[PDB]
Design a protein around this nucleic acid. Structure first.
Lengths: 245, 190
RNA sequence: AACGCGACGAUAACCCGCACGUAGACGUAUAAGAAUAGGCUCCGGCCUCGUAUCCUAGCAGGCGAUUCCUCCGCCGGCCUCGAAGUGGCCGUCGGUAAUUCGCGUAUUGCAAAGACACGCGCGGGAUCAAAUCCUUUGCAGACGACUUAGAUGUG
RNA sequence: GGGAUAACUGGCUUGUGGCGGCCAAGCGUUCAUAGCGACGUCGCUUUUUGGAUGUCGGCUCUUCCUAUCAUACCGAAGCAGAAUUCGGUAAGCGUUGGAUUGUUCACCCACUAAUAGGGAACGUGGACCGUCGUGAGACAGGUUAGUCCCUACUGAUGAACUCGUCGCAAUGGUAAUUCAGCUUAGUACGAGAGGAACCGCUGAUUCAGAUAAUUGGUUUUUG
RNA sequence: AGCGAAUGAACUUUAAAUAUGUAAGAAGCCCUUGUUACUUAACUGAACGUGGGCAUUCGAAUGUAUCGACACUAGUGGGCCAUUUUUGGUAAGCAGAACUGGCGAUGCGGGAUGAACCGAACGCGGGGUUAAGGUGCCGGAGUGGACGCUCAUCAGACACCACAAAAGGCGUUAGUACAUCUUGACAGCAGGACGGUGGCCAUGGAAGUCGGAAUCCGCUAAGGACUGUGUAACAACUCACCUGCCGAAUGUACUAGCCCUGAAAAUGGAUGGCGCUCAAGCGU
RNA sequence: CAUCGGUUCUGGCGGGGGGAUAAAGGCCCAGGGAAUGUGGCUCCUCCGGGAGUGUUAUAGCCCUGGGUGUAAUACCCUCGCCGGGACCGAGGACCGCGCUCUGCAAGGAUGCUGGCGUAAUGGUCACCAGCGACCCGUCUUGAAACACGGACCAAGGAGUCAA
């Protein structure tokens, strides 16, 4: 009848990918199964996934896939009766969540060593546990909120002032300078965005992202690997720890 | 289409006392008691499990199930008020004339009164009477900031809107004259 | 409100005469409030239904018993009722089938002008308490109308 | 000279042009092509340098409408302030002149908060008989056509409800308007120039109801 | 209708509807035979004479308060409205013909009321049943029954439309055609939203986002030489799009009903009034 | 008031016929099938409550055919019986048609009882009450609408007489 949302048409070139994209994903995984030998399965639970591109560029040799877990798992073949190769059903039962596949032609031990050595600093995702009581001084709020020494720190922008005020900082932009309390300083007390042990929420995570404060560690947890010749999957550490269905 | 039946569920925590006699939802908690009459809508209340209240309509319309949804939300807000309570951190800004705010417990009627002076230099003193049950304090952590704490979300929000509306600029360019008292934070006491 | 209402003050009772006795009774009986996605309660339980309750017998309702202390009614006292005003309790007195009788009812035929008392009345008479007319006043007046003052006195 | 219509409008009136093409959902003779066809756009009016008004009026008064000039209220604007513009809620309030003209408006200038628009049955105080002419007309020729009653309302009285005093209030009407000065303040704001508003106080205009202490005026008080 | 019949509204085997002309015996028919003043080549026609048959179905149905003729005797000789058909015209009005009906000379019930509407016609009475129209009250008769729709800041109310439009409605209900959907649909939350590359021309300076053109490739799960915010330029945010969490219908355009607006001035008044909201409104 | 005659309104009852010789339905018989899956089994935040499974088990259901069966009942048509109510009694020797025939409900109301004279029943006037209801004549028009005449009462007052 009536009383419904006014659907906002999107005046933009990019469109839905859809059924064609999904069947393209089946085709890609199914055709890339045969060439490679070690199909690793890995997890990235609650880390931002910018650096997957960098690890792609590093392991240019290998081929990596990451989509719908269900889509990829059934492209592999969940049921053993409809299965591309023996043991791939085991790989499917490993595939549960924030999970990616890694076709490789080279040494699994070297793969494990490199992925153990892989480690990057990152801005924290929502839901994690904060390790520090990071705060901003009562004086002028700078670009990073005081993490680097203020003498070598540029002030943060009046453009970002409204966002900080919206996300909760009692900050005021006086004389063109954004400051928590008084322009000279003192006056106020301070603003602690997050505390030690506190479960970081979306608000605090956006605060760290705006103030360029990193408190998460991008690392990939290899659940397991399947060999083509043997046709079996060997779980390692994260494989047994991470629940699967 | 005249839906035969529809239900919604409201979970209650372990530390409350909820009672609906006819339609007077009275919820009792650590901070106090909140009572609201819901006699204007047709709903059937029951206790569907140990700690979830089921509110239902039988032979009702889409408007009626919409009423069920909104009354569910109001009851949930009462539960939240009696468990955690509501806090409104209010901020005031000035350019050249510092605004003076004074809060006083008028003992008769037992109510807060907030007086605002030197708002853009007007000699008038804006006195606002405060909602019953909610408390006002001058925050010491931050400057030019007040705290409005209470149990009733409706009362605290209406009072904050009353302040933000009484402190309103007339016949001046809003782009230049930025003075006023504004809402900053809305959350729970805990 | 000149045909809406209230409170109060002050009156009109006697003598003689003479004139008549329902826009709808027939058991014209019945006080919680409040809600209707709740309520009542005796706290056991109860609620579609006032399709209920009360009352309901005697010559248009007698007489005498039998026998009952149950209701009804009248007056007093105590209090109570004010939204356009009353009921309860107690006491006196009168009546009173709950029970059970004997006396009378008729031929009014098979349904369709007497006396007394009480009031409302008028015709005169004299009785209060007043109003108006008259005179005066002039805070008033087209004319009516209105404010006063005239019976012993701050006239 | 004959014929015909007795006469007009009455859910009529307002703010957005016409012609042609392009596009066009639908419908259609059988299908968007027998063809009809809104909104837009294009071409013409329409682009390269900034007086119209004939009979009329003129004044006052009552009432009503708003399609609101001002007062009140807010929404928007490079709205710094001040001064403004547009929009809407609003009819309680008030809504003045001069020039010019046959006369009105336009325009023009003076006050003023402002000089807004209307309705009230558009509210109350000649044509033939002819005669003389037919390339056009005239006629001192005629026939001549041609209107004090009722009652609402108000005021003052008023019969009966025994006379008088003190009251209640259903109902009906209903009233206040605008400007100015001091303080805020030469402050907020502003490069300068300039320049507010709230609170509080004091006046003035108009309207309304009163009154003669004091000041003018009036003298069948004939003092 | 057919054209597996021919041919091609102008096609037709057949054949409508629909009103509209003529005939349905005894006073009628047929032919035979003759005359003629007429006519024709000619009883060829016309009239005049013969003949016959068939009177108890004399040649369909229904109706039957009769019809024909002559003579004589009064009053009248207007139109108005509407249905249908038809002709012309306008922006719309309208104008002209023919039929029929009604009023004209007609009372009565209903539409609150009435020249043009519906039913029905008339002596005086009693009883019964109906039509149009009604059954909340005025008002006699149902707050009758069944299924649904509608809440109007002057709804609507029974036999009618203009305003009016492919008109605006985040009112409500039914329905149609398409599209996604555990291969996880729409919405939401946590994120990613890259690289060549500050792409080419231009210029104080313009880096996806003041301007003209092109708008490609890698990575892809996806990411546009970019949808807005923003900077002097950056930056940064955000959009498209894509993955994680949740889990079951949706969402795009239309049709149909009921409702709002779709235009309104001036004395106070109208579904007749009161009033009515699971109606006392609307459809059956 | 009883028995009747005519018209009429309104209730109940005994039958007959027809459908698909109603369809259904009860009870059986036989075959088949299914879930909004009965019992049972397994899992299952256990007063409880779900999920899967599997065709009658500790419930049942649907489809088809047969018997009871010419079943009953609804609907329509039809043969009759009884009850309550309203309005009227027209004509006045016999005749006729008939019947249930010693007379009858058959060409029209009688029988019984009671009331009625200081009043049964009426009349006029006045008023109230329900419903209805424009002021007459003339004249015009299709019709209205205008217009003409009407202060009242009594008497007079207008198609007559000749050839």
């Amino acid at each position: 009848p009536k009383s419904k949302r006014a659907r906002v048409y999107h005046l933009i070139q990019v469109n839905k990918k859809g059924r064609e994209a999904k069947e393209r994903l089946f085709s890609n995984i199914r055709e890339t199964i045969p060439k490679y030998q070690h199909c690793f399965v890995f997890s990235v639970d609650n880390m931002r996934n910018n650096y997957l591109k960098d690890v792609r560029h590093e392991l240019n040799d290998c081929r990596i896939f990451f989509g719908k877990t269900k889509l990829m798992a059934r492209a592999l073949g969940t049921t053993p009766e409809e299965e591309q190769a023996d043991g791939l059903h085991r790989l499917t039962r490993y595939l549960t969540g924030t999970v990616g596949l890694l076709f490789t032609n080279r040494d699994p031990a070297d793969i494990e060593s490199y992925f153990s050595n892989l480690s990057q600093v990152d801005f924290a995702r929502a839901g994690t546990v904060a390790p520090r009581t990071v705060t901003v001084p009562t004086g002028i709020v700078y670009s990073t909120g005081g993490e680097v020494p203020p003498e070598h720190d540029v002030p943060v922008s009046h453009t970002l002032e409204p966002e900080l005020r919206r996300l909760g900082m009692p900050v005021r932009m006086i004389k063109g300078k954004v400051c928590l309390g008084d322009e000279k300083g003192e006056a106020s007390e301070g603003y602690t965005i997050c505390k030690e042990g506190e479960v970081l929420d979306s608000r605090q995570t956006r605060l760290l992202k705006l103030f360029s404060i990193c408190l998460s560690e991008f690392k990939v947890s290899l659940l397991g690997y399947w060999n083509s010749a043997s046709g079996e999957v060997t779980e390692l550490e994260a494989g047994k720890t991470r629940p699967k269905r | 289409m005249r839906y035969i039946h529809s239900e919604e569920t409201i979970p209650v925590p372990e530390n409350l006392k909820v009672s609906i006699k006819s339609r007077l939802v009275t919820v009792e908690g650590p901070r106090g008691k909140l009572q609201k009459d819901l006699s204007h809508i047709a709903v059937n209340f029951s206790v569907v499990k140990k700690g979830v209240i089921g509110l239902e309509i039988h032979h009702g319309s889409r408007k009626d199930v919409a009423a069920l949804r909104t009354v569910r939300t109001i009851i949930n807000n009462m539960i939240i008020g009696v468990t955690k309570g509501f806090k409104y951190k209010m901020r005031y800004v000035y350019a050249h004339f510092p605004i003076n705010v004074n809060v006083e417990k008028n003992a008769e009627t037992g109510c807060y009164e907030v007086e605002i002076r030197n708002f853009i230099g007007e000699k008038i003193v804006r006195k606002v009477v405060m909602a019953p049950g909610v408390e006002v304090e001058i925050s010491k952590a931050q400057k030019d900031e007040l705290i409005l704490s209470g149990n009733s979300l409706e009362a605290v929000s209406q009072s904050a809107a009353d302040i933000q509306q009484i402190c309103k600029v007339r016949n001046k360019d809003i782009r230049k004259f930025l003075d006023g008292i504004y809402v900053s934070e809305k959350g729970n006491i805990v």
